Structure formats: C-alpha cells, structure tokens
Ligand binder design. Structure first.
Ligand code: MG
Ligand code: MG
Ligand code: MG
Ligand code: MG
Length: 1298
RNA sequence: AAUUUCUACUGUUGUAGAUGAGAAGUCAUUUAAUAAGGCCA
DNA sequence: GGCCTTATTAAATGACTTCTCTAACGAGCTCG
DNA sequence: CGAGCTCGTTAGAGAAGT
C-alpha cells in the first residue's frame, strides 16, 4: 500500500487562531490606541500602494514606448513560431528558445540601463537619506504640483498635496513594504512569470499578433467583402494615427491603413496600453456621443459576412483582442457612462427623468402621453396614409407578432405569401439561382418593411385560413392604440414611490445596495422596466440614421416630426437604466480584517532569540495552553539574557528559537564578511573561489570576476578546500554534519540543505509566573492566548487539524527530528464586529432540531445561542506559517516514484474515477483491476454519519438565487463556500477510499477550452474537486491514526506531486491521472458499441448509398425485433473493427421536442420497432420471410422516406434518454453480444453502471484502467505515454472479456 | 443554532469533516443595457 | 415569444500564476 | 569623532519540466 510514502517533500500552511487578550492587555492596547492607529495603517497603507503603482505608470511608459524598438528580430520569431505548430522533434525549439530570449534581452536591456531601476525597490524610493530628496517624493513634488498635471483625480486620494503625506508618514517604515517591492520586482522580471511585462509582450501579445495577422492575409484570401476600408474609415481613424511608422521613419499624423497595421515590423507600436486600446478598437469597435449605431471593427465585419451571406466556416478567422499591459490604467475610446456615487443620485437622477417625461409640453402644444393616444388613434381612422408608416423587420416586428397573434410566424409568412404573387409572377424566375440575399432580395433587413406591404398582405393572408375570424390587420393596428396606457402605468407608479424616494434623499448614504433595501430596489427596478419595456414597443417605428446609397424612404407627414420628437425624450433609458443598474449591483464594502503592528515594522518576521528586540513577539506554554506575547516598542529588552536569569522560576515555558535561513545566503554572509573575515581566516585560494564562483554550477561570481567551471577537473575542489569553520562561530556550533569525505558528498546543494535541515533548534526556558503577570499589568508585554476551541476545557472528542499541527510544533516527539518547523513572517489581525447582537434562541426554552432520524426533537440549553458569535465580537487573529516535512524537501522526480510503486504494487490497486457535470456533480466508481466495479455512489448526497444532505439541490438552489439576484439586482450570494464545504465531504470520502481500497483516482481531462464556457453552469465542480484534491493529498493526516505512526500527524500521507501550477502538471499529479475527454458516456458497457455513424440527411441520392452500406436490415422471425446488422469497414472516416448487430427490441425514448419555439422545452417517446413497421406499411416493403431486405429499401426513393429512416436511426443510436421524471436516466444497449439479453441499467446488477452517468465513471475508470496496464508493464522506455488515442481505447473496451 | 474559517449539524458553552495565509497582478465568466445580424417542426 | 452570433460598457464572483515564510552584517546615525 | 546603536540591506545552490 502507500505506507512507505511519507516525508516526501516540504510544504507550508498558515494555521489561524484567535488571540484572547489575557490579564489587562486589552486594557493596555486600548489605553494607548494601538488599534485606532492601526486601521489608519492599512487604510493609509493601501494608499501608498496606489502611489508607488503610479510611479510604475511613468516608468512602464518609458521602458516600452520611449525606448524598446525591437525590429527584425520579430520575423525570426514569426518564422519559428508558425513552423513550430506543425511538427517538432528537438530542433524547432532550439531556434524558438533563442528567438524568444533575444527579443526579451532588448526589452530587458532598459531594465539595467535606466536610473529608475536601482532606486525603485529600496529606501531611495520613499525617503532616501538625510540630504537627499527621494526619487518618488521628487517625482510627485515639483514635476506635478509645480508642474501642470492632476493625476490623482481617479482615486480615494484627494489630490497630490495630500498624497505626499501618505508617503512621508512611512518614514522608518521602509522594510514594511518588503513584500510589496517583491511584487514590483515581478512586473519587470526577465523570466517566465506571468506578472512580467516581458512575458506580456513576448509570450502573450506577440503570438496573439502572429495569428492575428495569419488570420488576416487568409481574410484577404477567401473573403474580400466590404470590410470598412472602402469608404468607412472616418470611424476608426482617431485610433489609426500611429505617430511613427515602423517600416519607414516618422510620419506626423497620417491615418494608417490595414495593410501597414498587420505588418510584422509594426508590432513595436503594440507595446504600451495606449497602443493596445488602439489595436483592440480596430478589432472590437466603439460607440460615440450623438451616436446612431456602432462603429464596427474587423471581428464584427467578419460576422456580417459569415452568417449573413452563406453557411459558414469563416467564424474561425475570429481575431483575438490583445491582453492589457501589466499595471496599466486602461482607456476605452468607447464612451464610458458617467457612473454615480451614492443614493442621492438614484432618487434624483431617476426622479428628474420622470419630471421631464410626464411634464413636457412641446412647441406644437402636446404631451408625450396625449400624442400616442392622438397620433396612433389616427392610425384607426386612416387619417394618415399607411405607406409612409414603417415597421422595422429586425425583431420589433416579430415581437409584435407573438404579442398580438400568439405566434411569431404571421407577419413574416404574410409578406412571404405576398412577395411570391404580387411583385413576382408565377413564372418562377430564378428561385434558387439568384441573389436570395440582403442585396437584392432582402430589402427589409436594414430597410423598413412598410405597413402597406402588411395591410393588403394580411388581407391576402386570410384568403386560405381555417376559421373565419382570424388574425388580420386591425389587431396589430389597435395594439399601438393601447400603448399609451402604459404611459399611465408610469407616472402613477412614480407617484406611488414618493415615500421611498424620500427615505434615500441624503448625500453619501450608499444604502440601496444593502440587503435592507432588497425589497425597495424591487420597487425602483420595476418602475424602470415599465419604461424599458415601453420603449421596446416604440422601437418598431424608429428611423436610425444609417442612410444607405440614396435609399431615402418617403416618410414625413406627421409621423416623424411627432414620433421621433417624443421617442427622443423616452430614449434616455440608455443613460438612466445603466447609471442605476451599475450602482445597485455592486456589493457594499465590508470592514477589513486589518493587520496588527504594535508599532513594529518587523512584527514577528522571525522568532529567533537574537532578533527579539527587533521583532518583539515571543511564544509561551503554560499547562498545554499556548500564549503569544508581543513586547512593547519602548520596552523591548525585557526578555534578554539577564531577565531570564533573574526570573527563572515555574510557569510559562518561554520558547527559545534558533534558525539559520538560506544557507546559500547566510554562510557566505558571515564567513566572508567585511567585519570579521580576519577571524575565520580564508586561505589564499578560498578567497577567489567566492570570487570566481567555482563552488557553484550556475552561481553568480563576485563583482569584477568571471564564472569558471564547476566540474571540469575540480568536482573534488570544495571538499578539501571550501569547508573551513562552522564550529568557530559563537552560536552555530550545534550541527554535527555528514562531512564531505571525498566519497560521501555531492555538490554544494547537499550541504546548504544539511545546514538548514539541522539549523533549527527549539528549546524551552521557564519564566516565573509572577514575573509574566508583572510586566502584563505594567504595560511591557501584550500577552494573548492562542485559542482554537480545542484548547478549551469542554473539548470532548477529536480536535481540528490546525490545532493538532500547532500542538505538534512544540512537542517532544516532534523536536527529536523536526517535521513541523515553525516559520516567521507571521501575521496578526483584528477583525471587527459584523453581525449585530440578536440572541434569537433564549435561555432554557426548547429548540426544534433539523433531523428526522434524530431520536430527539428539542434541546434544553441553559445558555443562549446567538446567531454568529464569530462575528458579534471584535477578535484578534494570528496567522502563523509552518513548514511541514522540513528536513525532507525533495519535490522533484516525484511521479516516477509512484510509477515505480504502481509497477510493483499492481494487482492490488483500484481505480477511483469521477464524472463532473450537472446531472451528477461527481460520481465515483471504484473500478478494480478487472473492470468489475466495487463501490458506486453519487457525490450528491454525502455525509453518511447522521445527516445525508443533498448538495446537488443546495447548489442548484444557489444558482437559481444568484441568477435571480443578478436579474433582480439583489445581493449575489457567494457559491464558493457552499461548494468548498460540499467538496470537503467529498474529498474526505475520496481520501478514505484512496487508502482503504488503494485508489489511483483518475479524472476526465477537460481542456481549458471546455471549462471556460462550462462556467455557464455555476454548480459545476470543474477545476475545484481536483484542486481541492491535489492540495488535500499533498498532506493527508488522519485524526484517528496514532501520532508518529504511518498516516499519523508526523508521518502523514503525501500522494500528489507538489501543486505548483496546472500548466506544468500534465496527466499525472502523483496518483491523480487524467484521461482525455470524449466517448466515455455513450458506450454500451457489456459490449463496447459507439456512435460512429452520423446520418444527417444531406442529400437524397447518397441516402440510397447510405443504407446500401449495411450488411442486412432484417426482421427477426425467432424473437420479434428488427436488426440493422452491419460492419463499419464500409464507412468513411475511422473504421473500428467489429461486426455490429444493432437492433430495436428495447423501447427507446425522449427526442426533445419543442412546443412553440426551439431549444429543449419538453420531451417525447417513440418505440423504434413499431415506428418502422408503420414505415414498412406506408410502403409495399414486406418482412415476413426474414432475409436481407436491404435492396428493397434503397429502391424506393422519396423526399419523405430517406428523411424519416435516418431520423429513426438518429433515435436508435440515441442511448442517453429516460427523462419524464428525471429519476436516474438509464441506458439501453442495442447489441448485447453476451446472450442477446440487453443491457438495461434499471435491471443492472451490483457490478454494472446504474444510469447514464454511472457509465461515464465506468469508462473514465476504464480508459484510466489501461494506464494502470501500461505502468504495470512499463520499462526503460521512460517516455511515459499517458496520452491515449481512441483507436486502441475502442479496441480495449470491446475486447475486454474475450 | 455555538467554529481560525467554511459546510452540515445539537452531537450540551460544543460534535464530524475540511481549512495555505498575506500581497500583487491578470484572466475567465455571468447578468443587464446597447449595436449590427442570423435561424426555427 | 424563444434560440444564437460578433462586439462595446458596467456590475458581480471565481480562479489562475508569480513573490515571501529571515538572521546578521554595514552603513548611517545620534551622541560624546 | 569613537563609542555602540538600529534599521535598511545583503548575502545570493539546485534540480524537472503541455
Ligand atoms: Mg513604441
Ligand atoms: Mg474535538
Ligand atoms: Mg473538528
Ligand atoms: Mg453550518
């Protein structure tokens, strides 16, 4: 089993705890004000990360725009990029790695050739030194305040007179930023990290520009349509300026053209953010002010030719927009809307609109309401001619169809039955071989279908109706007579909300977005949608000024000096509905769990004894209780070597901590020091090895020297030379190494570990209890208690894991050989109060339970039970890192150790396998090493202890609440915590099965192209069961198992590779194999049949060729069902060997019919056998003899016959069915090669799948079962072939039992 | 309806499982409004 | 009355990929 | 005008890898 597989690689956690202020430390903290001046150092510290990240926005516009013109190296990259995608053994990446790095070393040459890069990451930024004004407060002071710039106009920072004060108040707090200046050494890294601006250009925006021009010279090919470069280039001209061409020299302000935009030499203008919001506006498009329509772009002009002209494959020249530049305040060029700030807008902006609608009198003396009851009433008495009245055949007409007529296809199929008889004769002049498109035939797409073409065409529509009183023109004509009644539903609903537009008329309230207004937003929202939906019923008469070539439609008489004057006021629900929707939908700002300083920039950066007057944080132990003492700033030497001797008594075991961090960085820090090199005495040759870097393979040389070779002829150099004195330091003589010895020791990596593996000492020194209480009462120590609900007295049973780790830091089983090394840089926090004090369950009165299996219905409870006591209290927290498996950290070549484990521990290893999705969120199936499954249950109902709750319906209830919250502007409730708490039940249920049944759990692949658009489902546990199973078998401790035994707390299970990324993961994360998607669910389990046919009814003549390919299509005399018994060798794409005998004995099912419109409303049911006997009754083909009846089927040609028999073959092949109840939708197998009795999974035994989704996990665990067959026979061909192609997969499934 | 935190609980000032935190950056998605379009037994 | 496409804007959530898990020396400093 | 003092800084291996 997995029992020799503990202590494999180091890890890290962060144990959280509460800190209870003991004694009068809470009296001392709140006396000075060490929390009231600490929410002013996380609210006034994130301001100084928005001032330093705005000096990086006047350095990232100088490292990419003003310099960095990487010319003609681009073509050397582009030649080896497109060539690389075809085929590559080992050569095409040699030039590709060279062409990648050579572009980077010109971007990262202005890294080390600028003045603003050394004085950017240290003290010289904020406050440099006495006598020097520092480069960030110099950049802000004279260049901005005395210059002309106001660039703090978009923040919570007011101006720049105030923004110097945030920076200057961190004087002395420069090492507080040492984790922020390591996130700005990542923006400029010349390495393969995605935070870098040299990865954003070379590995994001450049290959997304090579394929962005390879899909444009293939767009001049195959498609020269009317893309914008015919006349329409007044639109995208302000974003085609490009003040310097990069095929030639400078050109002042000429408008570029699309030929010299996708030139490879002009990528060097697509570097900064001002030239990516000037390239995505090419591809995307933009809106303007005083607009009529949209200014389109190349990925929109391809849409209007792809679908509008033909049936298409031109969608796949969809050109990507380029990713933004790191740290960049992006621009739009697309009219961002003037978003509002508080609640005094939403009841004044919304209030001033309906003041202007209901109380507007024109210069022609009318109102908006009494000129649709007066002007659309003139449509009844025909006072206006019905030919200058125009609909708009895009959607407002077809929306008017199934609003008046209860059918969409009335006005559509009444001009269809009018254009074929009136404007066209019965001569049938070119029906198909003509235009039939938007140019000559569809003259009403962009143009306006007249009501004169509706008046005497609906009158012609009723000439062939069934009943007499049917749909005709005066029902359309009287709807718009009833449209100014919605004018009276608004402005009476607005007078209805006169009492809730006054409970929010106060500036800066910001309360409509609270959940206390969740039922009053509903009154504000549904007053907008009585105006939004009103102005989709006047979007039928709208003349959009997009005038075509002299095709001015004649329409003037009292219908557009009237309608477009009153539609012009009511069209302001573009700037009313979105200034409000974007304000309500935002979450309200919760309070912060800010970080505790106690006036110390290095608070608990280290626990070491030598640094405690600098760190000021000590740990204690008193009777299995743990204590956090934080010394005062002023009184920091109150635990020195003197005060422990004068107070050595009985009580708090104070913790003595010894640490040697970074033996690469530390042993040549003190030995080769510029203070005490004379004491360690390096020889004449050691002092140049640290210069020439001979002791390293790839280590840096000291300045002014050159890297020599590690192991040319001196691999045995450092053994007898570079090993001098660790046992001469005053403190560090505690090690006892496994010294070099010329035979027993490799390179300098294996010494700097054995320093750090042994450079950790934890010892205990008693302090008398009367002294600790004396400094706490005085003000010289802030003692807290590290409290975790298992350190309480009432802890009956098993504790947590983040308690059973913390007890195991300070143990004595631990410190014999350290597994649980405590770390530094721990954080202290203070979460304020969130939930109010409402008791809701008072004393001693009974409370009804929530379990029907529970042999109890009430509970007494002498004490109260407030709702959330976590959040009714102002708490102190303590995030504390650990470094589990400390002296073992080999995290490399992990997966070959498992593939050598499973090569020996085969025939005893089972295959867990999980299907994600919606019908089952997960579905394990413990398939053993022969196929015959053992356990099988959904992970929908989980928690087998005493509850058995159903999270599949809990998560679906959040989806239907989240999606309702988005569409009702309610608060979107976070589904990730319910899903984290659901999966914790699953993972533990997995983790028990991994050890009890020896699993090698295998998922479906789900390439990231799938799961991006599978985020439509919100209950789906894609990416999330696997990420919470890799990091949960990285360290798998069993609370039942004995402390220091195999799966215990010291020795715990490590069964995944260390989770670095998914990118360098592949298809083996330890034991978490992946298998690729497709053809897992649709397979008969007992035989192995698949859906390798695809009838679609393309033509009629080749349909005769389709049903001639079968071997025989016969009725069975002996039993009574049809057969389509064939072989697949006589078919097109990929022949799978096997003679299939598919049948129609099983009664198949649901075909997904459609009631009024399409896309999966309802279901059906049809039997296959009794559907084609009807078809052998409609035609003269008989079947009583029982032989080959193939030739009779191919003879009788019909439009009906070969469009129906394929649609029955698209139903016998449909195996996943069995709706109408949605109760474990089973499978029917056609072939059944065993005895002819089919596989119907309702009547399935224990060791077969039970529904359709149990057949996915039976085959994810079956293509993942031949992974375990390769590994069982794997050898010196170490190229581990985990990728499978379904040519042997289909071979292995079918030939299983044999 | 009690938690370092989350989920389910009453298991009785708690019970069972899980818990890698901080910071920075980006990306993906959903919904809505808008724009131009396509299709339907 | 539905479904889908290409975009743009705004709001949300979810989730990826990087850095760190540090004691000791040396300026730089106030003080004498 | 050197005493320590005290915070910003400095020291700077090594291996696998859609
Ligand atoms: Mg440039
Ligand atoms: Mg316990
Ligand atoms: Mg527990
Ligand atoms: Mg709960």
């Amino acid at each position: 089993i997995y029992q020799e597989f503990v202590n494999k690689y180091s890890l890290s956690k962060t144990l959280r705890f509460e800190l209870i202020p003991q004694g009068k430390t809470l009296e001392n903290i709140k006396a000075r004000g060490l929390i009231l001046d600490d929410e002013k150092r996380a609210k006034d510290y994130k301001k100084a990360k928005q001032i330093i990240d705005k000096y990086h926005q006047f350095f990232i516009e100088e490292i990419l725009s003003s310099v960095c013109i990487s010319e003609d190296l681009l073509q050397n990259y582009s030649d080896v990029y497109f060539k690389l995608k075809k085929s590559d053994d080992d050569n095409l990446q040699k030039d590709f790695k060279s062409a990648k790095d050579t572009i980077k070393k010109q971007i990262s040459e202005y890294i080390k050739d600028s003045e603003k890069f050394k004085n950017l990451f240290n003290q010289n930024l904020i406050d440099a030194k006495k006598g020097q004004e520092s480069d960030l407060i110099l950049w802000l002071k004279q260049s901005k305040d005395n210059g002309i710039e106001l660039f703090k106009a978009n923040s919570d920072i007011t101006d720049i007179d105030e923004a110097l004060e945030i920076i200057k108040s961190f004087k002395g707090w420069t090492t507080y930023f040492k984790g922020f200046h390591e996130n700005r050494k990542n923006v400029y890294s010349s390495n393969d990290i995605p935070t870098s601006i040299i990865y954003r250009i070379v590995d994001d925006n450049l290959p997304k520009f090579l394929e962005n021009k390879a899909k444009y010279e293939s767009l001049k090919d195959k498609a020269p349509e009317a893309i914008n470069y015919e006349q329409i280039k007044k639109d995208l001209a302000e974003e085609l300026t490009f003040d310097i061409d990069y095929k030639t020299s400078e050109v002042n302000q000429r408008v570029f053209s699309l030929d010299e935009v996708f030139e490879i030499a002009n990528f060097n203008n697509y570097l900064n953010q001002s030239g990516i919001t000037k390239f995505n506006t090419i591809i995307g498009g933009k809106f303007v002010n005083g607009e009529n329509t949209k200014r389109k772009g190349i990925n929109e002009y391809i849409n209007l030719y792809s679908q509008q002209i033909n049936d298409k494959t031109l969608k796949k020249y969809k050109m990507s927009v380029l990713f933004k530049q790191i740290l960049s305040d992006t621009e739009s060029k697309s009219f961002v809307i003037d978003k509002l700030e508080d609640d005094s807008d939403v009841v004044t902006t919304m209030q001033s609109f309906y003041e202007q609608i209901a109380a507007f009198k024109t210069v022609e003396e009318k109102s908006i309401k009494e000129t649709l009851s007066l002007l659309f009433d003139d449509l009844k008495a025909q006072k206006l001619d019905l030919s200058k009245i125009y609909f708009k055949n895009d959607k407002s007409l077809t929306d008017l169809s199934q609003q008046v007529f209860d059918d969409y296809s009335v006005i559509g199929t009444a001009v269809l039955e009018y254009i074929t008889q009136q404007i066209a004769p019965k001569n049938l002049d070119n029906p198909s071989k003509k235009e039939q498109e938007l140019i000559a035939k569809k003259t009403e797409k962009a143009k306006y279908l007249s009501l004169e073409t509706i008046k005497l065409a609906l009158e012609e529509f009723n000439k062939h109706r069934d009943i007499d009183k049917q749909c005709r023109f005066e029902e359309i004509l009287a709807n718009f007579a009833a449209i100014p009644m919605i004018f009276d539903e608004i402005a009476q609903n607005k007078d209805n909300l006169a009492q809730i537009s006054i409970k929010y008329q106060n500036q800066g309230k910001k309360d409509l977005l609270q959940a206390s207004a969740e039922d009053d937003v509903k009154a504000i929202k549904d007053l907008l949608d009585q105006t939004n939906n009103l102005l989709h019923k006047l979007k039928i008469f709208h003349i959009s000024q997009s005038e075509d070539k002299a095709n001015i439609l004649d329409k003037d008489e009292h219908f557009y000096l009237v309608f477009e004057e009153c539609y012009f006021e009511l069209a302001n629900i573009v700037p009313l509905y979105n200034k409000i929707r974007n304000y309500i939908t935002q979450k309200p700002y919760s309070d912060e769990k800010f970080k505790l300083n106690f006036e110390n920039s290095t608070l608990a950066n280290g626990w070491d004894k030598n640094k405690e007057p600098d760190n000021t944080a000590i740990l204690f132990i008193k009777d299995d209780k743990y204590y956090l003492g934080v010394m005062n700033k002023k009184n920091n030497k109150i635990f020195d070597d003197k005060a422990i001797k004068e107070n050595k008594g009985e009580g708090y075991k104070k913790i003595v901590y010894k640490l040697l961090p970074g033996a690469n960085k530390m042993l040549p820090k003190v030995f080769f020091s510029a203070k005490s090199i004379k004491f360690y005495n390096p020889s004449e040759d050691i002092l140049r090895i640290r210069n020439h870097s001979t002791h390293t393979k790839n280590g840096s040389p000291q300045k002014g020297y050159e890297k020599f070779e590690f192991n040319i002829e001196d691999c045995r150099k450092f053994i007898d030379f570079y090993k001098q004195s660790i046992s001469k330091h005053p403190e560090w003589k505690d090690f006892g190494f496994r010294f070099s010895d010329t035979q027993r020791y490799n390179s300098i990596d294996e010494f700097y570990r054995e320093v750090e593996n042994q450079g950790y000492k934890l010892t205990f020194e008693n302090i008398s209890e009367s002294y600790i209480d004396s400094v706490v009462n005085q003000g010289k120590l802030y003692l807290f208690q590290i409290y975790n609900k298992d350190f309480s007295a009432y802890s009956k049973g098993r504790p947590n894991l983040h308690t059973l780790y913390w007890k195991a830091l300070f143990d004595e089983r631990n410190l014999q050989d350290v597994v649980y090394k405590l770390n530094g840089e721990a954080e202290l926090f203070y979460r304020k109060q969130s939930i109010p004090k409402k008791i809701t369950h008072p004393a001693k009165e009974a409370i009804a339970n929530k379990n029907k299996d529970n042999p109890k219905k009430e509970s007494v409870f002498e004490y109260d039970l407030i709702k959330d006591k976590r959040f009714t209290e102002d708490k102190f927290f303590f995030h504390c890192p650990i470094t589990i498996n400390f002296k073992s950290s080999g995290a490399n070549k992990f997966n070959d150790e498992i593939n050598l484990l499973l090569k020996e521990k085969a025939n005893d290893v089972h295959i867990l396998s999980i299907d994600r999705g919606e019908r089952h969120l997960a579905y394990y199936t413990l398939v053993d090493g022969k196929g015959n499954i053992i356990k099988q249950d959904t992970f929908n109902i989980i928690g087998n202890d005493r509850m058995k709750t159903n999270y599949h319906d809990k998560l679906a209830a959040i989806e239907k609440d989240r999606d309702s919250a988005r569409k009702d502007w309610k608060k979107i409730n976070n589904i990730k915590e319910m899903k984290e708490g659901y999966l914790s039940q699953v993972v533990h249920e997995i983790a028990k099965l991994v050890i009890e049944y020896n699993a090698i759990v295998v998922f479906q692949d789900l390439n990231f192209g799938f799961k991006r658009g599978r985020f439509k489902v919100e209950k789906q546990v894609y990416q999330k069961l696997e990420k919470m199973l890799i990091e949960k078998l990285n360290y798998l401790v069993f609370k039942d198992n004995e402390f220091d035994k195999t799966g215990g707390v010291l020795r715990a299970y490590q069964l995944t590779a260390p989770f670095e990324t998914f990118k360098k993961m592949g298809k083996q994360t330890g034991i978490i194999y992946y298998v690729p998607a497709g053809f897992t669910s649709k397979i008969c389990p007992v035989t192995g049949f698949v859906n390798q046919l695809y009838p679609k009814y393309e033509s009629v003549s080749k349909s005769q060729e389709f049903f001639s390919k079968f071997d025989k299509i016969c009725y069975n005399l002996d039993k009574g069902y049809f057969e389509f018994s064939f072989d697949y060798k006589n078919f097109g794409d990929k022949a799978a060997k096997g003679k299939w005998t598919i049948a129609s004995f099983g009664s198949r099912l649901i075909n997904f019919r459609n009631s009024d419109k399409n896309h999966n409303w309802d279901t059906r049911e049809v039997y296959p056998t009794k559907e084609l006997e009807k078809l052998l009754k409609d035609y003269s083909i008989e079947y009583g003899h029982g032989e080959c009846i193939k030739a009779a089927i191919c003879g009788e040609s019909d439009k009906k016959f070969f469009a129906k028999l394929t649609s029955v073959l698209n139903t016998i092949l449909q195996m996943r069915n069995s709706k109408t109840g949605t109760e474990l939708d089973y499978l029917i197998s056609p072939v059944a090669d065993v005895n002819g009795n089919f596989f119907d999974s309702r009547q399935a035994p224990k060791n077969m799948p039970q529904d359709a989704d149990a057949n996915g996990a039976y085959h994810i665990g079956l293509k993942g079962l031949m992974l375990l067959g390769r590994i069982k026979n794997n050898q010196e061909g170490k190229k581990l072939n985990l990728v499978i192609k379904n040519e042997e997969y289909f071979e292995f499934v079918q030939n299983r039992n044999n």
